[PDB]
Each structure stands twice: as structure tokens, then as C-alpha cells.
Symmetry: C3
Subunit: 276 residues, 3 copies
């Protein structure tokens, strides 16, 4: 409905104005190409960082939001019907400013959680853990309103570009930060709390061989390469060391780490190019 696109675009413009200045910029950053939904959602959520200086008006918001919605409608129709597409888009449109506020808190969590994060522009423009969450919070609305096929395709699109695999059904709290992220897998029935931090190669997955994925409390940190598997619960304030294999419930305020250290035992160019 044209009326919903227009109402949502004005709500978005209001959201831009009440932004903290940290989320603003007078600069004109270079073009970022990726794929359609991400390019558009980036522009819609944070135009200052992804658009030409002259294309940051209400009409540009309306055009971009309309391109996004029409593409989403055509895809949901291809897998399902017009009736379901409309229901999904309506829900998405009503949720868009809420999504935008959630993505801002993800960005805040990245700046807080990463010593290498120097500014919000760096995080917004280049942190893949942020871009996966821009797409996931949109895809999750679609999934929850009955579209499980396009929402999965959407997540597989961002999966391809970041190496981060999050199912559209995953339920994720606020201030969620994935650092680096390549190899991260989070399954359909997983539940994640607030202020969680997750590193590369972490799996929140099903047992190797209904609810079949982990639930994670608040303020949980999961170190690189940990594999957290099965319908289990990690309590709040848990820290999980790198490469742990975790298949059991873990109580709150715990620290989990591989038990023991490994074993240690002791002990030009022309030549190399002469051999080929």
C-alpha cells in the first residue's frame, strides 16, 4: 500500500532527526556494492554513511523503501502468494523504525566490545557482524509472519557475503555483537539474550547426530571456535573459552574452558624457481 510506504518513510525521517550525532555525518563516503537488499537496507537505515550528499531527502527514503518492498513482495509471491506477501510487508513496514533502533544498539555493542573499533562510521560501513544483523532483524519479521522461504534466501544472501550463517528464525536480543564472524552458525530455534558477544567459528547448533538449538542468557561471551550444541541453556554472565565443545546446560556466572593444556616436544628463491 502506497499509504504504508509513505507513513513508514516519514517515521524513518523522524528517526534520523532524533539520532545522536554519533550516528550522523556530513561526509560523503564511497559507494558500497553488495547485493540488492543489503545496499538498500544500508541506505534506508543510515543514509549519511551510504548515500550521496544530495540523496538524503524524504523522496530518497521513499524511493529506496519502495524498491526494497517491491522486491520483497515479488520474492514472497514467487514462493507463496500476494496475500502472504502483503501481510509480511505490512508487519515489516510497521517494525522498520524498531529494527533501526535495534541495529543502532548492535552498533553500540560493537564499539563497546571491540578495541579495534575506532568510530561508528567504520562499524556501520564495514563490520560484517553489523550487516548480518541489519538483514537478520528484517528477515526475522518476515519469518515470524509466515514467510520461511524468502526469509531463508535473504539470510543465505548475507551468508554468502559475510560467511556468517544466521537462520531467520533465530530470536536475538539487543546489543548483539559478532566480532569477525566467519564460520558463525546460529540455528533456527536458537534464542540469544542481551549484550551477548560471539566470535568467529562459533556454532549455536543442533546435536551433530521442535526446539533443538541452544538458548543463551544475557551478557554471554562465546570465544572463537566454541561449538555449543543441542537444546541446552547457557545462563547469563557466562564466559565460554575458545574451542570448547559444549553439550550441557551451563549455570549463570560460570567460566568454561578446555580442561588441560596440550603436549609439547622439542625440535633460496632462485633455487626454488629453478625447479619449475
Amino acid at each position: 500500500m502506497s499509504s504504508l510506504l509513505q507513513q513508514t518513510s516519514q517515521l524513518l525521517v523522524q528517526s534520523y532527526q532524533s539520532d545522536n550525532i554519533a550516528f550522523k555525518s556530513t561526509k560523503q563516503f564511497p559507494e558500497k556494492k553488495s547485493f540488492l537488499e543489503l545496499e538498500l537496507i544500508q541506505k534506508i537505515l543510515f543514509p549519511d554513511f551510504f548515500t550521496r550528499r544530495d540523496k538524503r531527502t524524504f523522496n530518497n527514503v521513499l524511493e529506496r523503501l519502495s524498491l526494497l518492498v517491491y522486491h520483497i513482495q515479488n520474492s514472497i509471491e514467487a514462493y507463496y502468494n500476494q496475500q502472504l506477501a502483503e501481510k509480511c510487508i505490512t508487519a515489516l513496514l510497521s517494525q522498520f523504525v524498531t529494527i533501526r533502533e535495534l541495529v543502532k544498539q548492535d552498533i553500540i555493542a560493537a564499539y563497546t566490545g571491540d578495541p579495534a573499533a575506532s568510530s561508528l562510521a567504520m562499524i556501520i560501513r564495514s563490520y560484517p557482524g553489523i550487516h548480518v544483523m541489519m538483514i537478520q532483524r528484517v528477515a526475522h519479521i518476515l519469518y515470524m509472519n509466515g514467510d520461511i522461504e524468502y526469509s531463508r534466501e535473504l539470510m543465505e544472501n548475507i551468508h554468502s557475503v559475510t560467511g556468517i550463517d544466521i537462520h531467520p528464525g533465530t530470536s536475538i536480543g539487543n546489543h548483539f555483537f559478532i566480532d569477525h564472524g566467519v564460520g558463525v552458525v546460529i540455528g533456527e530455534t536458537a534464542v540469544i539474550g542481551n549484550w551477548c558477544r560471539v566470535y568467529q567459528s562459533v556454532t549455536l547448533g543442533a546435536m551433530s547426530f521442535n526446539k533443538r538449538h541452544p538458548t543463551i542468557g544475557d551478557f554471554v561471551v562465546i570465544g572463537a571456535g566454541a561449538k555449543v550444541l543441542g537444546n541446552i541453556t547457557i545462563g547469563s554472565n557466562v564466559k565460554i573459552g575458545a574451542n570448547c565443545w559444549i553439550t550441557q546446560n551451563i549455570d549463570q556466572d560460570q567460566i568454561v574452558f578446555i580442561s588441560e593444556h596440550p603436549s609439547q616436544i622439542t625440535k633460496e628463491n632462485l633455487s626454488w624457481v629453478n625447479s619449475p
Copy 2:
């Protein structure tokens, strides 16, 4: 060669028609872009999910097939010569329907092996483990007929898009399912049986530190859980399940469940303020 292209085109048309109903669809999906060989192979193997409804005639199949093989022929020539390129292409065309039947079984394996896979359409359009096998089964025929350079480049292309790293020399049986797949690495001389399932971050690789076998051979019905590292010229029997994060460096007999010996150990023990910092 045109006569071979026409027969393969006609055999593919016949293959489409004998498909089970589950592989067919009357719908018009949005176009999917990636890179040339993947887009073309997708349209060649499953037109119903990747092409405009008015581009599904024998001639459209022949156009897509011709463009694919002739891009392959031009790349192989660049590394080698026209004779080897023709040889590789001929083998690929003659195996093309065989490849299609194998990919269909990979799709079946994905559907049975994944509680989140709800339809064949979803699997066909979006599962990276299926897309990597579309490429790998093509590349492997090229490699086996002598083109080791372009078949590797081809595999690195699909690597760049899926994060799944499979060598063109890898020998892989039917009904093979990779779930999630990022970080998967499978080496040149590895051999994989039938009905295997492999998860993210799995290596079937060489020992960290000719006709050699330096990568693993795994049997049928093997499941390898996330993060497992299976290294060296070792054999994993059929019906073996390997738990997550395992480090395997020895042969494993059939009918074994393998897992890390010990659980990890375990010991006990806003925006406003945050926004004040980057503002100032």
C-alpha cells in the same frame, strides 16, 4: 562440438520431463546472480527455479549449454591448448545428465538431513552445500580429463562465494550433504562415500606437518560434526559419527562413534554514557 551440444541439450530436456514432481515448479522466481559458471549451471540443471518462464525451450537450453562449455573451453585453452580443452568439454557434455542426477540426490540428501530444509525449492535456490556440489561435480570431470588449472580456478570461484573449499580432484559419492559449510576444506586426494553429511568448519585435510594419498578416505553414512579436523592418509569406515571439534589422525573402523574424551572445565565467578564517548 555442435552435434554433441544438441544431443546433450535434448537429453537434458528429456531429463527435465522425467523429474519427480517435487523438482518441478510453475512459479517465476527472481533472478539469482553470482558468477557466470554458477548462474549457467543453475539454469541448466533446474530451469524451473532459475529462468524466466519464456526461456525454457530446447533452444534456450542449447544457448545456455553452449555459452557454458565455450567459456570453459576458452579458460582451459588459456592455461593449456585447444586439444585438451576439447577433450575436457567432451567428457563434461557426455556426463552432463549424470551430473544432474547426482545433484538431485544431493538435494534429496539435504532435505532428509536437515530439519530446517522445508522444500526442494529452498534447497535448490539457496543451499550453499548444493551450489558447491553443482560446481564440484562439473570441475571434477574437467580435472580427471587433465585440466588441473582451470578446474581449480573454478573451485576457488565457488569457494569465494560459499566459504566452502573443495578440491576439484576430490572424489565424492552420491547423496552428499554439506550443512552450513563455511570453513569446510576437503583436499585433492580425499575420497567420500555415499550418504555422508559434513558440517561447518570440517577439514578433511593433510597432516599439518606421484599418485600419493595424503587426505582422508571416508566410507558411506559417515557424519562429521562441526569443527572436526580429519587429517592425513587415514580411512574412516562406514557408519561412523564424528563429534564436534574432534582431532582425528588415525584410521577409524566402521560402526564407531568418536568424540572428545572430556567436557571443558567450569569455575564460578548504558547507551547514554556510551554515546557520550564517541560524541566527544
Copy 3:
């Protein structure tokens, strides 16, 4: 500026002439697309493998180099200003043939370090560990001279394409080989010596929960899945086995590996297709 671009172009052309037999090629390969900076750096460093035969004159080199330089300059200007952008561009130009020498040594390291590496052509066109180092050696110059935002952006672009995550601040010696590479993460303050070899899913990272990343010596090999965390040192000639969790220093001339083997215990298409349809 125009004259430094011309002298850098002539030094590059001479560097092409100086190459060993093995880095040359009479054949013409199909173009490779990715993203702008990688396409240009590939063509500038190895024209024989990435450009048409008729686009290898001095002016062709000068146009490719200028396109790159002007793209980087505007990108840095966008995050900072003309003053810093020129400082970085000047530094990069003065070091361009040095970077080319280092990348050739990375290629040599890949050939000697990988049995699947059959030829330099294959390595130059297709090895993602080489492509990430083409970018990183450029991005490191930019980072060292004050541009920490665009050099990060650059590294994230090559990250999307390879799944290899190397910070622009990382300091890396010569003959560096990443095999496979997906899931490799190397942090901002890490230091890597010469002739090191790193596999997929390796982290040289900070503690999960100034310098906070590891220093690695010469001839270190780190197997797949190893996590090396914190401001620790791995001495030279160390071999680190797959999936190791390293949180303490390792002296030189050591082999490190998980000490215990895993425990073990014993124990129709048509029908499936009817199920869902």
C-alpha cells in the same frame, strides 16, 4: 601527483622486465572480476595473468596505477582530508615495487608450501591467501601513515571475498603463506615473522574475555583450527597442531599438539519424495 605516478610506473615496468622466467607468461587469461582495488592491484602487480596482451605498455601501467591511486585518495579524503590522503598515497607509491617483491615471495612460499600448488599461474590467479596479502601489504602502508579507516574498509572488502580476516595494522614478514584460509583471523597488534604457514580457521587473536595479539617468529606452522590468544609469543620453528588452544608462550624448536586421542565406542529417493509432495 603526475610525476611520481610516472616514475612509479617506470619502476614497475622495469620490475616486470627483471622478473624470473617463471613469473612471465605468453598466454592471455580471461578477465577476473571481484572488487575494484583487487582487480587493479592484480593487474598492476601481474599484468601477464590479468590483462589483455595489448594493454601492457607504460601508459597502460600508468593508467591502471592512476585509477588505483585516485580511487584510494578519494576514499581517504572521504574519511579524512586531502593532506593525509596525499601522505598515504605518496608512501604507497614509493613502496609499490617493494610490495610487488614481497608478494612474489608470498607466491614462492605458496608453491613450496602446498603440494596442490602446481604452478605460479594457478597461485597468482586463484590462491585467496595470495590475494589477501596483495591487499594487506597495500593496506598496511596506508595504516602506518595515518589512515586507519579506509585501510580497515579495504581489508573488510577482501574479507568478504576470501573469508580471511587480517587487520591492516598487522605486521607480517616475508614468504607468508595462508593455505585455504577461510576463518583465519589475525588481529591489529599481531606480529608474524618470515616463512610462516597458516591454515584455515586459525585465530591469532586477543583473549576472548597496548599489544593484545600474539607475536610469531620465523618458520612457524599453525594447523587448522588452532586458536592463539593474547599477547603471547610463539618462538621460531614451532609447529602447532590442529585445533590447539594456545594461551601461553611457546619456546622455539617445539611441536605442540593435543595430547589425547578422541574416545570411541561401537554402535529410497521415491519413498522420501512422496513424503513432502
